[PDB]
Amino acid sequence: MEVIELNKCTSGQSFEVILKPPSDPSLEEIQKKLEAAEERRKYQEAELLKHLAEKREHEREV
Amino acid sequence: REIVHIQAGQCGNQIGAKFWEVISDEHGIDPTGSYHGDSDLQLERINVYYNEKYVPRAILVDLEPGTMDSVRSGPFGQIFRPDNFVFGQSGAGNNWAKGHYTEGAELVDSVLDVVRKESESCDCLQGFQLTHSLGGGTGSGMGTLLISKIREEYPDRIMNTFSVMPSPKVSDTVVEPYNATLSVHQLVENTDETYCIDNEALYDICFRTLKLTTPTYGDLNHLVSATMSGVTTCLRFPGQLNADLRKLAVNMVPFPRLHFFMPGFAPLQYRALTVPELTQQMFDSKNMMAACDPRHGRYLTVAAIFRGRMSMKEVDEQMLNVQNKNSSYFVEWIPNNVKTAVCDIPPRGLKMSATFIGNSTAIQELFKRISEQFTAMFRRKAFLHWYTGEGMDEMEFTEAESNMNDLVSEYQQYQDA
Amino acid sequence: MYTFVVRDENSSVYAEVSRLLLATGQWKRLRKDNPRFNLMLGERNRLPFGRLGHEPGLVQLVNYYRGADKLCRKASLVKLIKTSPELSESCTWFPESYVYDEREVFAYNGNVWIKSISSEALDFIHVIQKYLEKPLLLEPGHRKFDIRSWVLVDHLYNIYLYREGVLRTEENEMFFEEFNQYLMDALNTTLENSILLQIKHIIRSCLMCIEPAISTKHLHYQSFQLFGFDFMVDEELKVWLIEVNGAPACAQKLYAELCQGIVDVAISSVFPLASIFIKL
Amino acid sequence: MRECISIHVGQAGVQIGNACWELYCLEHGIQPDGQMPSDKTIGGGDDSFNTFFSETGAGKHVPRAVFVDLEPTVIDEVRTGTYRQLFHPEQLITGKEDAANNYARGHYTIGKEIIDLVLDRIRKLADQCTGLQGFLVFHSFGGGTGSGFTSLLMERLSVDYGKKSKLEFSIYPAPQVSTAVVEPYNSILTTHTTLEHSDCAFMVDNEAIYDICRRNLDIERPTYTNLNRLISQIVSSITASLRFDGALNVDLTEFQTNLVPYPRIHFPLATYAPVISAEKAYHEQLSVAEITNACFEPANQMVKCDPRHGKYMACCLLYRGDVVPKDVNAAIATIKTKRSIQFVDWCPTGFKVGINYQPPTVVPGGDLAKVQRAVCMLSNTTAIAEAWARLDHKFDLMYAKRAFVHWYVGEGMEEGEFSEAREDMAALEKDYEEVGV
């Protein structure tokens, strides 16, 4: 068991004791994927308003 | 996080009014709108349901004036905002089409004017709560018409209903199965959470358990009051969790169409119940308000709220207890699907109570029941002229029968997965 | 009422343990993949030890010791006995062995040998042992044999040696009463004195060696496990260890007694309800 | 001196952050009004504590901190709490409505509305730094904000401070204090999206802390306050070297150098001892040997798992209190002959030790008794993969039926991001098994 790199100071000490040795996406890419998700939301909401508009016309026809 | 409350038709306004009688008492608000409470827990989330005196964020809707004159004359009748009574004169004749297509269509825009002025002055609108029955014509037909207009105008708010299901045992007319089947089709597409309150179960609890030989609608509605109070405790009182309508929906609804919950309450009073009794009664078929045997299906999700001063350790022990003997009855592919919440303020006249909310595939029994009664008449096209006289075609009936049989299919597949 | 699952469907022993448990009226068996169990009779391979002991409100018990493989895989066992100081290089009861390695150091100056037999040295492209040239022969028949002992290790790391061991070589199983009587008449000694002391020493030594690596004393789930040791007896009545089996079967007549001893000591010790072993 | 910025995201990150900065103030002697009587350099400095505190001309000591929550209830209690005077109103950042336990909502929908403001508030701290090292990010795996917004924030920090280090403190989800069925989903989504952006991440399993509070503090139902004060102690041991004089782990780059030889395997296991009760009437003070040995008991780990059945890639011992090197090597010597402690071959078997002589500090009136010597072990074991396997299994159970998927798709996510995230995790479990068995 060997001790190395012993460092002392007023607050304490540190050291290393050895037991045995050895044998990014750009801001635009982010921007694309975020906006492709918001498009998907709006597509879904446009579909919902579309089916609601159909329901409105059936209400008129009845 | 304000909630806008709507009550429509006879049943919707009678249960809605008891609800506001119960929670106003819990929150210290008196029949005049003035507060006389002793704790501030009573006021920390008072805004969820009340506007500042305190006036309920409530809209009262009917096609007749009868029941609303009652409400205005009953216990807390003057608590309600007079501008928020929206009604016509001719009624809907227990007829879905009159509520959804003719009579109701004439009145709906005015209702949305009151809904709009209530939403505008909301700092952060959670969404909407509707009380109504599915068997008549206003709560059913006009009620679901409102839900369609609210979703179109507020597509990104939560829509929640307390929906009373018809039953031959306590029945006003033979066309209730038609009205309910048309309504369930709407509810499956346009609500996030529906509390299925079955008049059969309410009757049986009053008869077999409470020992009431002639249960009135007021006895039935006292049970609905307690359950509605219990089921909204977390929204109205401060908790470690921040319960709101959207979090409930996210955690309770794994599949968008399967959002019909089985409520239950305990106890149905000088000996307070011990925590073991609460948890045992709560999950007892006899304590649930939809008339489905939970042992006939599997829980997808469950939320349980305990009210009063008790050992949270024994709550957890008993909650963990009950899961590890009825594990045959919770789906294994939704890990940890039982949530537990506690609140220190008990409801009036109880030191201990518990409220169950279950998303169980046993609820399919209830839709099957409606489907059989429906098919029995529709096979001979009986009583249809009441609806074709308002402009409806048979096809819309066949479509609603098909969509509800599908709903039952969907509940059945997850029960075997 | 306790809960348990079954995930080795074709284990004779825990087939019988599950049966006994049900007939208690106090144990229900769940589906393989329901996590809300007290007890797991686990698969023999890739047992998911890392998912045990994370269920709030459930004391969980399992019928295998994570890490016991080091004793039940021939390659691992030889590494353990050569390399562990508690067993020393050559501990006098394990045949000198070589583990795809050691070819060079494989002192080959009687030089017969033996899997995972010949006399000349490797074309089976596994470990290599000294075949015991001079075993002990039951007469009449000049017949070989080996000895199977069942050992149960409970959650407390108690070591339980089943008093019924089998000898497979007659009815080809010879049990202890017969074998003891033979040794007395044939050799003037007992089964306890000439053989069992060595066996109990070997079982102790192996299981105490690995105890720090597999003990579940302060773990968040608990383990027990049934082992099967196999020995050969030579002609100077010296006992040798062959292999340790981590998922053994029992002999036919003994399936009843030993599966009861498992419930008694390994299971009901942890999950109590409303001796056949020798503690080592 | 080189500054570090701390970013607290969501309820868990904010409440844990409250606990840490309170503890920092008690340890550095900074009063709730930001004054520091022992700081003789009024109005500036390049002392060690200045890594975490800037200074005003009026002598106020301000955390280099940003608090972010998508809803305002939790960060409001900091606006009005006992440390309101500590922070500049605009390092606390709140919005209108939260993410509703939904990763997609915190990341895609409600996230884009606030990401630029938060980056602006962060940039305002970075310009007050002579040589910023990087960030310490606190969040839950399980919340909508903690998972969804944090991974969004991590992406942009890589873009805006590509050369800075990013450490995480992550609260891993436990049913006995959980808040959503969908936390396994959020957990995986956010690990997948954040992995390449994080240099080193300390996972704290709520299950482990909860049981350490019941077992060693005799608290029957532990609160967040109990959980978070104990977590504050582990965090404070980990960060003590950035805030105090010393030579071990003195900057954020040294955490990666000392604990992370492979970039993706950057999840060190933290173990801490000792944890005692303040209401323990009579208590015997444990020895260096006793507390070091306690570092190898799973019951003291921040994550339950069995390090005997994996391999170490690095071990670090951080002592506070009455500890001299000789005791530590005597306790190591002895434990090496009792414990199965196996390193990977291409790594030296041994320990890095740091000792700070100031013993741990305790919140007055809290639940932790004052001790004369404590230790936090940081070790990179392959055993921590047990927690990924647990979490990925729960994810598989739900995703095989698509349960709850529609809530994420409804915010603009595609199912592909689920299976992509889950596949990255499957790769992460493989990497661990390569190195470990």
Ligand SMILES: Nc1nc2c(ncn2[C@@H]2O[C@H](COP(=O)(O)OP(=O)(O)OP(=O)(O)O)[C@@H](O)[C@H]2O)c(=O)[nH]1
């Ligand atoms: N340790 C600890 N865990 C917490 C705390 N608060 C919440 N959690 C855990 O955090 C996980 C998710 O919750 P939060 O972090 O509260 O969620 P959030 O980020 O605010 O997200 P939303 O509220 O969904 O927007 C759950 O596992 C909780 O158990 C805390 O103060 N301490």
Ligand SMILES: Nc1nc2c(ncn2[C@@H]2O[C@H](COP(=O)(O)OP(=O)(O)O)[C@@H](O)[C@H]2O)c(=O)[nH]1
């Ligand atoms: N539980 C309960 N059910 C009611 C009440 N009033 C009516 N019902 C039921 O409500 C249904 C009839 O609808 P109703 O509310 O009367 O009609 P509307 O005015 O057309 O909405 C039937 O199934 C009745 O059994 C009530 O106060 N409580």
Ligand SMILES: O=C1c2ccccc2CCC[C@@H]1Cc1c[nH]c2cc(Br)ccc12
């Ligand atoms: O907000 C809530 C709420 C709202 C209104 C009434 C009652 C409650 C119950 C308390 C908790 C939920 C939300 C929640 C979080 N995690 C969960 C896991 C399951 Br399973 C079910 C639900 C939840």
Ligand SMILES: [Ca+2]
């Ligand atoms: Ca008209």
Ligand SMILES: [Ca+2]
């Ligand atoms: Ca200074």
Ligand SMILES: [Mg+2]
């Ligand atoms: Mg009526």
Ligand SMILES: [Mg+2]
């Ligand atoms: Mg939050």
